Every structure is written in structure tokens, then in C-alpha cells.
């Protein structure tokens, strides 16, 4: 049984608080990665993170792709996406296949 962590702007991500999700509010590169690496230390299952927040920390994020857990999942803000989640799927498919196959 693993925990859920959410990283994003106060406005967009606060309602996740109602489910008992450890919602955290980092805003600089230092805060996000510092807040992720502990979440991995406490065997979190999934960490949801905003795309705007995610864009600050590609180095810390790619460090866990190969791990079974935690799953790091990119979500929009209230403002939307930068296209990263969909581009990461885009990159991974062209890498595996020689696509685009979608």
C-alpha cells in the first residue's frame, strides 16, 4: 500500500487534498526536486505533478522512469499544458519504433 503525492500551484491542485493525497506547493527548481526525492524515499506509488512545475525539473524526473514505483504523472494546471506529457509519449515511441506510428 503506497501513498499519493501531488505537486502543483495552489489554485489547481488543492482539491486533491480531500482524498488524503499529500499535496505540496513547490514553485522553484530547488523545492520540486527536494519534495520529490523525499516522496521516493517514503515509497510513494504515484506522484502527480503539474507540467509547468515538471518543466523545471527534467533531470530529477527522468531518474525514476526505470523504477516500478513511484510513477510520476504529468498533469495540466488550471491554465493547461506545455505539451510535455504528449511529447514524452511522442519521444518514447519514435525512440522505440522509428515512428511516428500513432
Amino acid at each position: 500500500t503506497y501513498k499519493i503525492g501531488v505537486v502543483g500551484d495552489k489554485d489547481s491542485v488543492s482539491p486533491f487534498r480531500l482524498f488524503g493525497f499529500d499535496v505540496q506547493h513547490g514553485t522553484t527548481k530547488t523545492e520540486i526536486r527536494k519534495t520529490i526525492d523525499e516522496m521516493a524515499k517514503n515509497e510513494y506509488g504515484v506522484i502527480y505533478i503539474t507540467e509547468q512545475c515538471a518543466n523545471l525539473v527534467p533531470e530529477t524526473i527522468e531518474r525514476y522512469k526505470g523504477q516500478l514505483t513511484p510513477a510520476i504523472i504529468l498533469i495540466p494546471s488550471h491554465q493547461g499544458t506545455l505539451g510535455i506529457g504528449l511529447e514524452e509519449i511522442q519521444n518514447s515511441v519514435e525512440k522505440a519504433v522509428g515512428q511516428n506510428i500513432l
Partner: protein, 176 residues
Amino acid sequence: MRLNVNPTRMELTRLKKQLTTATRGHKLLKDKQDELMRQFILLIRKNNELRQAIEKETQTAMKDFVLADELLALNVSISVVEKNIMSVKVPLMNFQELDRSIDGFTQLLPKLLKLAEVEKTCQLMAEEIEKTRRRVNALEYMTIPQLEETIYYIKMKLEENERAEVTRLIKVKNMG
């Protein structure tokens, strides 16, 4: 570039066996790489439509809430069973005025989790593809060539030695 081995008859036989093994292993590693790839394509398509759908919906939920206090001060954790796809270890994830905006979030959770699961599985699937590619490649472009080049070298050397011996034996004989 040839390997650092001594040109003996036994070494030649070793490398020749090691090479037949290497060749067969390379084909089997290519076969897997291709299997994982077509299994990957199915799942990555699932991931993509899923991510497009849950991006559009989480976005609306978030926008509603914002357009609507520490009323959010008052638990759900998840369960991870483990399964196997081909040979890859993969996660199985199960749950364990403004009221309209709060509800929309409740309806996202199931789709967010499935995504978490499908995205991870794809991620793990993709990594294992790279892992197999690197082995295939290390075999095709380094190991097999080195074996092949060392084998040809030792054949040649063993041949020069045999020639050297007959030269010396002819001279020895003729001390008479």
C-alpha cells in the same frame, strides 16, 4: 580490433564455439526486441488516447474549481499488485455553489490512476526495449566482429608457425 588471446589450437576452438553462441544469442535478442516493440505499440496507443482524454478533463475540473477557505482540511491510498508482460515487471494499481467543482475531481481519480498505471507500464516497457537494443548492438557491432577478427588472426598465426617449423626442420635435416 581483435581480443587479447594467445594463438593456441584450444583458444581457436573456444572462440569458434563462443562465436556460434554469440550469433544465435543475437538473433534471439533481435526477436525479443521486435516482440516487445509490437506489444509496446499497442500500449503506447492506449497511453496516448488516455492521456489526451485525462488532460482535457482534469483541465476542465481545475478551471471550474478556480472559477468557483480551508474547507479542504478534512483518506485514500493505493494498492500495487505486480504482473509480467513478456519478461518486464509491470504495476497493477487499485484504489485503497462549489459542490459541482468538487465532484468533477472525484470522477477523475479512476482515470488518473489507470493513466498512472498505463504510463508507467509503457515507461518500463520502453526502458527494457532500450536494454535489449544495447545488448543486440554490443553483440552485432563489438562482440561478434572481435570474435570473427580474432578467429581469422589465430588461424593465420597457427599457419605461420607451422611454416616456421618446417623451415627449421629442413635446415636441421640438412646439418647432414
